[PDB]
Each structure stands twice: as structure tokens, then as C-alpha cells.
Amino acid sequence: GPVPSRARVYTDVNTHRPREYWDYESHVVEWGNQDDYQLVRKLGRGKYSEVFEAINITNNEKVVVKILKPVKKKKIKREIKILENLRGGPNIITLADIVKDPVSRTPALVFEHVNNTDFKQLYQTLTDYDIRFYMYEILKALDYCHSMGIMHRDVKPHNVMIDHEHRKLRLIDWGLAEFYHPGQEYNVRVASRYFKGPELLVDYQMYDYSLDMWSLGCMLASMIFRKEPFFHGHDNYDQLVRIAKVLGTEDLYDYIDKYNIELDPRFNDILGRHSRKRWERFVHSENQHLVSPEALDFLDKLLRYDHQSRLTAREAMEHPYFYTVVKDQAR
Numbered sequence: 001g002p003v004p005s006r007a008r009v010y011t012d013v014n015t016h017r018p019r020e021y022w023d024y025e026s027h028v029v030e031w032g033n034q035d036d037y038q039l040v041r042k043l044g045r046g047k048y049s050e051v052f053e054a055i056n057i058t059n060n061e062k063v064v065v066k067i068l069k070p071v072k073k074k075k076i077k078r079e080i081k082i083l084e085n086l087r088g089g090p091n092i093i094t095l096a097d098i099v100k101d102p103v104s105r106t107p108a109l110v111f112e113h114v115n116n117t118d119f120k121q122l123y124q125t126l127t128d129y130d131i132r133f134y135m136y137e138i139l140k141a142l143d144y145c146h147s148m149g150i151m152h153r154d155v156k157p158h159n160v161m162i163d164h165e166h167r168k169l170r171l172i173d174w175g176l177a178e179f180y181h182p183g184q185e186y187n188v189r190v191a192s193r194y195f196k197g198p199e200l201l202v203d204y205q206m207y208d209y210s211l212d213m214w215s216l217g218c219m220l221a222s223m224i225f226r227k228e229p230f231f232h233g234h235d236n237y238d239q240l241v242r243i244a245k246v247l248g249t250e251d252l253y254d255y256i257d258k259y260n261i262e263l264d265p266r267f268n269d270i271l272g273r274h275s276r277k278r279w280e281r282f283v284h285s286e287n288q289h290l291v292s293p294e295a296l297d298f299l300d301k302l303l304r305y306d307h308q309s310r311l312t313a314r315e316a317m318e319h320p321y322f323y324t325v326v327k328d329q330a331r
């Protein structure tokens with residue numbers, strides 16, 4: 001069978017916590033009063049929830065209400081417990097309340113309101129500095145959650161709220177997040193296709209915080225190269241092919257060998273033989289102003305097959321890409 005794996009960092013953070021911290025199945029949900037909120041306008045629907053701007057009638061405060069679509073008690077408890085454990089951490093969305101929505105008979109999560117600009121409009125306006133700055137802000141949230149024993153498992157533009165005017169960022173949507181326990185075999189059916197790590201695509205279950213760093217690298221590539229998505233697969237199998245056309249097949253097969261991974265037989269014909277491509281292949285007149293040696297070196301060190309080889313959040317924050325931003329924030 002496959003060779004086991006452990007996180008390089010924060011390996012045993014949960015092992016030393018009280019059981020209650022990570023044992024979300026045991027959590028008893030603390031309900032507030034649904035009548036404290038009035039819905040104002042619908043912001044969007046997902047597979048898992050519908051989101052509204054709302055108002056707390058008592059405090060006259062703007063809030064956001066996420067009405068949960070029906071999922072197992074355990075899934076709701078996991079998201080609640082994680083949000084509560086992380087509350088107040090850097091750039092983590094603040095869970096203000098949990099209420100019972102009367103019509104749905106489902107829970108509703110009540111969050112702080114972020115004055116977000118839709119990424120589809122914002123990302124084109126972002127300068128070189130802006131990308132560095134917001135990447136650093138995401139890394140603060142990821143280092144925090146990782147240090148707290150939690151994997152996000154769904155890092156993507158949709159889940160990063162940016163109030164541009166205030167240079168304010170929040171990481172949202174902890175509905176897929178999980179506690180890291182060394183040796184645990186996780187569900188590979190997580191995250192969004194274009195951002196899935198190689199570990200997920202080859203069905204390597206003993207993954208860790210490093211998954212988030214692959215997803216982040218996918219985001220960085222899409223931003224600096226003006227290419228959304230960066231890895232555009234048609235399906236889950238083709239997704240690995242798209243990655244292999246860039247990172248090359250030699251390193252892919254090296255990863256599979258190192259972990260003794262059993263490759264799905266579907267994969268063989270389509271995978272072929274591909275060189276590792278130079279990042280400069282993706283540079284053009286429209287994106288060159290965003291691309292530096294620094295940016296490419298950093299990206300190279302996130303987008304690695306071998307989860308153990310990728311930069312940590314904490315390592316990434318020390319990269320030369322960020323020297324200007326670190327200086328400007330100690331102003």
C-alpha cells in the first residue's frame with residue numbers, strides 16, 4: 001500500500017489540545033435568536049448555502065447570513081467548531097451568531113459584513129504591489145489556521161473577501177475545512193477542480209496543510225499570468241493532465257514512486273510524456289508588469305507535486321517577493 005505521510009509543521013497541534021477542541025461530533029450547538037436579524041438582499045446561492053446581507057435589528061449592525069442547505073449534523077458541527085476555534089485570528093471571518101432559520105428548519109450562520117469587491121472586477125485592477133499585499137494577508141490567515149490544526153481545503157478567489165478601500169481581507173467558507181491528525185486518511189473529494197492538489201487527483205489520502213499551499217499557488221498563477229483558471233481541466237483525470245503538461249511527467253511519476261501510490265488505470269494513456277515548462281512560457285504583453293523573478297521563484301516553490309516539498313505558509317511569508325510589503329507594514 002501507500003507510504004504514510006506527516007505534516008512538516010504543526011504536526012501534533014491537535015494531539016495536545018483538549019479532546020473537545022477537535023472532536024466536533026461531540027459539539028453542542030449554541031443557538032441564538034433568529035428574530036434578531038432581518039434579511040435585506042440576497043448575495044448569491046451555492047451548492048451548500050444561500051447568502052444574504054442582513055441587519056441585526058437590536059444593534060442596527062449590517063451582517064451576512066448564510067442559510068445552510070441540508071447536510072449531515074456532523075458537517076455543520078465541523079464548520080461551526082472550526083469557526084469558533086479560529087474566531088479572532090488574523091484575517092479569519094468572524095462568526096457572530098448561529099440561529100435556526102424557521103422556514104428552512106436549517107441552521108443559519110451570521111457573519112461580520114465585509115464590503116467585498118467581486119474578484120471578477122477587482123483582480124484586473126490589482127497592481128504588482130496589490131497582489132503581493134493581498135497574498136501576504138491570505139498567508140497570515142493560512143499560517144494561523146494551520147498553526148491551529150485546521151486545513152481550509154477550499155482556498156480560491158471566491159472564498160477571499162477583499163474590501164479594497166480598506167486594504168482588508170477575510171478568508172471565508174470553512175464548510176470544507178478539517179482538523180489535521182497525523183495518519184488520518186482524508187476524503188480526496190474536496191476543493192474545486194482547478195485548485196485540487198495532485199494528492200487529491202491521484203487519491204493519496206494522508207494529505208495535510210500543504211494542500212492549501214497548492215491551491216494558493218493556483219491562485220497566484222491565475223493572478224500574475226491573467227489566466228483564470230491556470231490549470232483548466234475538463235474533468236478530474238484531465239485536471240492531472242493539465243498539471244503534467246506544465247510541471248512535467250518525470251516529477252509526477254517520481255512523486256507516485258516515492259509514496260508507492262497506485263495510479264488509477266484510466267490515467268495511463270492520457271498522461272503521456274511532457275517536459276517541465278519554463279514559467280516564462282506564460283508571460284506576455286498583458287501580464288508582464290505583474291511577473292518578476294521573485295514571483296516566479298515563489299510560485300515554483302508552491303506548485304510542487306510532492307506536498308512535503310511545498311513552502312509552508314510560514315516559509316512563504318519570508319520569501320523575497322514580500323520584502324517591500326513587510327517593510328511598508330512596519331512604517
Ligand SMILES: CC(C)(C)OC(=O)N(CCOCCO)c1ccn2ncc(-c3ccc(C(=O)O)c(O)c3)c2n1
Nearest residue numbers: 043044045046051064093111112113114116118172173
Ligand atoms: C457573490 C458576490 C461576490 C456578488 O457577493 C459577495 O461579495 N458576497 C457573497 C459571496 O457569495 C457566496 C455564496 O455564493 C459577499 C458580500 C459581502 N460579504 N460580507 C461577508 C461575506 C461572507 C462571509 C462569510 C461567508 C461564509 O461562507 O462563511 C460568506 O459566504 C460570505 C460576504 N459575501
